[PDB]
């Protein structure tokens, strides 16, 4: 276990993130709760692994759309479409993997408020990733499961985390993106991000130097998103 941790830190350095997932996965399966460092290692592992497929999915989708506007393009489109289909399959498998670790191990055993918010936010993230590309009923089940996870995280973050905490701010940023991009609710998105930005101002001095730098960059993304959403 202490070995699996060390080998995850090594895989990160080698930027071999699927091996980082394997090591962090068996650590999150064993009963003991994860430290701060260990849950960040788990998040970085899975986010880098799904992130490569998300980028591929998006560039292949754009190629596909471009191609299906051309006349007499049915053969190229079905090659593109079938290649995209292989990327979607890995997207759902990576999401289900982390989602099952969350539902069966990490969310039940979480005892601090931080850990509880951290994991419900991750859960909202990966249901959101599923909603980005899934068709029909699977998009609706992921859309609703994402909302419910961000909602639960927000309820707990409201009572257990101060308004300037990186985890709380990061939660509101990702929840606001869900509202804007998945639920298509620019009013809910805009206000949630604005309220979260403002509420972090009063207590900027209570944070450690490293936490202040995490919250600064999160607030930069909130600001820049607000600029986009107010055209």
């Amino acid at each position: 276990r202490e070995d699996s941790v060390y080998l995850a830190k090594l895989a990160e350095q080698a930027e071999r993130y699927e091996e980082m997932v394997e090591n962090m996965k068996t650590v999150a399966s064993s009963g003991q709760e994860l430290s701060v460092e260990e849950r960040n290692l788990l998040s970085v592992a899975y986010k880098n692994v799904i992130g490569a497929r998300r980028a591929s999915w998006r560039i292949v989708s754009s190629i596909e759309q471009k191609e299906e506007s051309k006349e007499k393009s049915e053969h190229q489109v079905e090659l593109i479409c079938s290649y995209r289909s292989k990327i979607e399959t890995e997207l759902t498998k990576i999401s289900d993997d982390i989602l099952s670790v969350l539902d069966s191990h990490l969310i039940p055993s979480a005892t601090t408020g931080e850990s509880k918010v951290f994991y419900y936010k991750m859960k909202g993230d990966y249901h959101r990733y599923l909603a980005e590309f899934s068709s029909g009923d699977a998009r609706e089940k992921a859309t609703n499961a994402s909302l419910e996870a961000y909602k639960t995280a927000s309820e707990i973050a409201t009572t257990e985390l101060p308004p300037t905490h990186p985890i709380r701010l990061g939660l509101a940023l990702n929840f606001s993106v869900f509202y804007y991009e998945i639920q298509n609710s620019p009013d809910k998105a805009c206000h949630l991000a604005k309220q979260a930005f403002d509420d972090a101002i009063a207590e900027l001095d209570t944070l450690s130097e490293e936490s202040y730098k995490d919250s600064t960059l999160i607030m930069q993304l909130l600001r820049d998103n607000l600029t986009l959403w107010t055209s």
Binding site: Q13, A14, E15, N40, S43, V44, K47, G51, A55, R58, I59, S62, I63, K66, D125, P166, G170, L173, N174, V177, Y180, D198, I201, A202, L204, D205, L207, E210, Y212, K213, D214, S215, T216, L217, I218, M219, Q220, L221, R223, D224, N225, T227, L228
Partner: protein
């Protein structure tokens, strides 16, 4: 070290290289244009702040061109919030040697990347490793670093044998006699004369001319060299060759107000000395004290700038404070070099007080207060060739030659010279009247001279100072008494209990003005106001001047209506200048209003930071303190030029640079962090708990 000087920072496979062939020729354009959309989720923020991530830039020029092609849509070699690109760029990670990449998001980090790449290119680097910490740097830390470690060096000058010709070169006069660079030397400085001649003969292509000034420099003589302008000699010290011991001269160093300048200026130099002391560049601040002594000794006065067409003109006087602050930084009484320097500076200050500021024609005999009222004849030659044409119906040659006399023109040009000497060129407070005003500005600064000269006499002259000129004896009590006289004259002619302002008093027509100016706060800086006077100025004058970004140079009411006939002037509303902030911050501190300084500094610091973050790190000559989005855009008179740079701004502006470092000294941790996160004053103040509201006088 991710934050070392760029000279350092940019000066196995990390060394030895093979062919890079990682990209097919079809990848960029085989499927058309395929730009990724920036993601707005938290994503890798945690790795960005804590991971110590490093990039591998395989080809600096290729990445630079990509970034400008995608993110610089108005094609000004700048990445700002007005560019309409996608605001994300992939860069290869160091640990994968470029085979994997991460995303840099947002105008600010992309602008920093543009800057770092441009700077690396300037050092000949075509491939680099790059710390993310150098591009996600907190903007308050970044601007402070650049001011302290890069801007002062670029603003520094030091005459030597190899640059005299270039420093002397001047372009404001287009006469035949101004084609060549020229240097003017005090008649009793023969070592300096021989030095500049030697400089000429070593660089004969410049055609550098060297001329002795006359024993006595009159307004008639200065007009006589209108067509043969020159730089003026400044203080110098002896230098030796290591090998032979041949002696040459090398100038004391000094700072210029902006990169396009080569001249030592007047009142900028004191504000710059303050910032230079903060940066531990004490030698540059001390150098300028040396030059100000040299000017007073050999030209009669501290000069607007060290060129011949300025020989009759000064600028607002700060020498006693400048000398004191350098003296302390050098170690005070414990350092005999500092003790000797302080004595020579106060001797020079006393001469300047007696023979410039409190001598005719600047002295108003009736009131005893002083005016910006320089000598000098004819039309100022250094302005643009047609600058005075709208005031010329009959010719120029015959008027300067004194053939045709015209006293309404003489009054016109007298006010023009006085406006320049006041530092406030130009403002509707002074147009057409300046040389008749006993300003609160100048007489506050003379009050400072008197109090400071009194302390120096008590403590370094055994309370008995003898003028080397008139051989009079004066004591600290005598100078404290002249200050008391001054303090009560200023109140008599200038203090307006109803507005809480000190108003300039017009001495020809013998009536007080009503123009509301931020220089009213100089009575606090100089220490002449009373508690009751200071209190009414905070209560009633400050609300008329405190705008979004700080103190406007004057109220909108006093400036009056703007039209085509009456265009905007740069030392009026809505513009804010660094000297007005700095003097006002310390003045208010002196009188117990530090809590008010904190608020005013937060406003000014936010405005500079916002422009720095959103507009490619720019620092500008003056700001619009009412403008919310682009306060650095100032189109008044000749407008700001601090925006004319490509990739990375190189120097800023002297007293503006200093104002940012000085203002930050007032900010505690909570306020520094809120400036770092770009929190506007309205939001910072309203976020304070009611206990902490008091720290900002609310």
């Amino acid at each position: 070290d991710p934050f070392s000087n760029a000279e350092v920072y940019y000066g196995n496979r990390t060394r030895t290289m093979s062919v890079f062939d990682n990209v097919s020729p079809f990848k960029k354009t085989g499927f058309g244009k395929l730009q990724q959309t920036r993601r707005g989720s938290e994503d890798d923020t945690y790795s960005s702040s804590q991971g110590n991530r490093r990039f591998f830039i395989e080809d600096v020029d290729k990445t630079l061109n990509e970034l400008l092609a995608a993110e610089d849509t108005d094609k000004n070699y700048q990445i700002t919030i007005e560019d309409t690109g996608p605001k994300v760029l992939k860069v290869g990670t160091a640990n994968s040697y470029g085979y994997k990449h991460i995303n840099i998001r947002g105008t600010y980090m992309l602008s920093n990347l543009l800057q770092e790449l441009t700077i690396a290119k300037s050092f000949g680097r075509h491939q680099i490793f790059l710390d993310e910490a150098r591009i996600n740097e907190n903007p308050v830390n970044r601007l402070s670093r650049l001011i302290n470690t890069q801007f002062w060096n670029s603003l520094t000058r030091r005459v030597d044998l190899n640059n005299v010709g270039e420093i002397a070169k001047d372009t404001k006069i287009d006469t035949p006699g101004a084609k060549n660079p020229r240097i003017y030397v005090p008649y009793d400085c023969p070592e300096q004369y021989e030095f500049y001649v030697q400089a000429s003969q070593m660089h004969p292509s410049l055609k550098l001319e060297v001329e002795y000034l006359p024993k006595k420099i009159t307004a008639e003589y200065v007009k006589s060299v209108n067509d043969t302008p020159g730089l003026l000699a400044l203080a110098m010290e002896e230098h030796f060759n290591p090998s032979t011991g041949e002696k040459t001269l090398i100038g004391y160093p000094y700072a210029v107000p902006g990169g396009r300048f080569n001249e030592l200026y007047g009142w900028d130099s004191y504000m710059m000395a303050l910032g230079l002391l903060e940066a531990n560049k004490t030698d540059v601040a001390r150098g300028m004290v040396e030059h100000f002594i040299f000017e007073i000794n050999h030209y009669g006065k501290i000069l607007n700038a060290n060129r011949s067409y300025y020989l009759c003109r000064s600028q607002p006087p700060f020498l006693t404070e400048m000398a004191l602050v350098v003296f302390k930084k050098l170690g005070g009484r414990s350092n005999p070099d500092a003790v000797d320097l302080l004595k020579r500076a106060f001797q020079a200050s006393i001469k300047e007080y007696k023979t410039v500021w409190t001598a005719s024609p600047r002295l108003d005999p009736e009131t005893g207060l002083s005016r910006y009222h320089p000598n000098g004849l004819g039309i100022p030659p250094e302005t643009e060739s047609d600058h005075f044409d709208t005031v010329l119906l009959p010719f120029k040659q015959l008027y300067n030659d004194g053939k045709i006399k015209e006293p309404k023109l003489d009054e016109f040009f007298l006010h023009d010279r006085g406006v320049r000497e006041s530092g406030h060129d130009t403002t509707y407070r002074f147009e057409g009247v300046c040389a008749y005003l006993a300003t609160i500005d100048l007489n506050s600064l003379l009050y400072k001279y008197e109090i400071d000269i009194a302390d120096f006499i008590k403590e370094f002259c055994d309370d008995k100072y003898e003028d080397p000129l008139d051989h009079s004896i004066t004591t600290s009590a005598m100078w404290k008494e002249m200050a008391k006289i001054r303090q009560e004259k200023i109140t008599k002619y200038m203090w307006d209990d109803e507005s809480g302002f000190f108003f300039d008093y017009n001495t020809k027509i013998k009536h007080r003005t009503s123009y509301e100016s931020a220089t009213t706060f100089w009575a606090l800086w100089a220490g002449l106001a009373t508690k009751e006077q200071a209190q009414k100025m905070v209560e009633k004058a400050l609300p008329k001047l405190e705008m979004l970004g700080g103190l406007a140079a004057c109220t909108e009411r006093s400036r009056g209506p703007i039209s085509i006939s009456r265009p905007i002037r740069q030392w009026d509303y809505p513009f804010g200048w660094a000297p007005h902030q700095i003097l006002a911050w310390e003045g208010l501190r002196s009188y117990g209003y530090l809590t008010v300084t904190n608020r005013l500094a937060y406003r000014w610091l936010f405005m500079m930071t916002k422009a720095f973050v959103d507009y490619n790190g720019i620092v500008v000559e003056k700001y619009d303190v009412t403008r919310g989005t682009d306060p650095h855009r100032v189109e008044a008179e000749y407008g700001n030029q601090g925006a004319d740079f490509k990739g990375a701004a190189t120097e800023g502006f002297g007293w503006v640079n200093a104002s940012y470092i000085l203002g930050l000294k007032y900010m505690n941790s909570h306020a520094r962090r809120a400036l770092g996160a770009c929190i506007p004053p309205i939001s910072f103040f309203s976020s304070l708990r009611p206990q902490e509201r008091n720290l900002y006088g609310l």
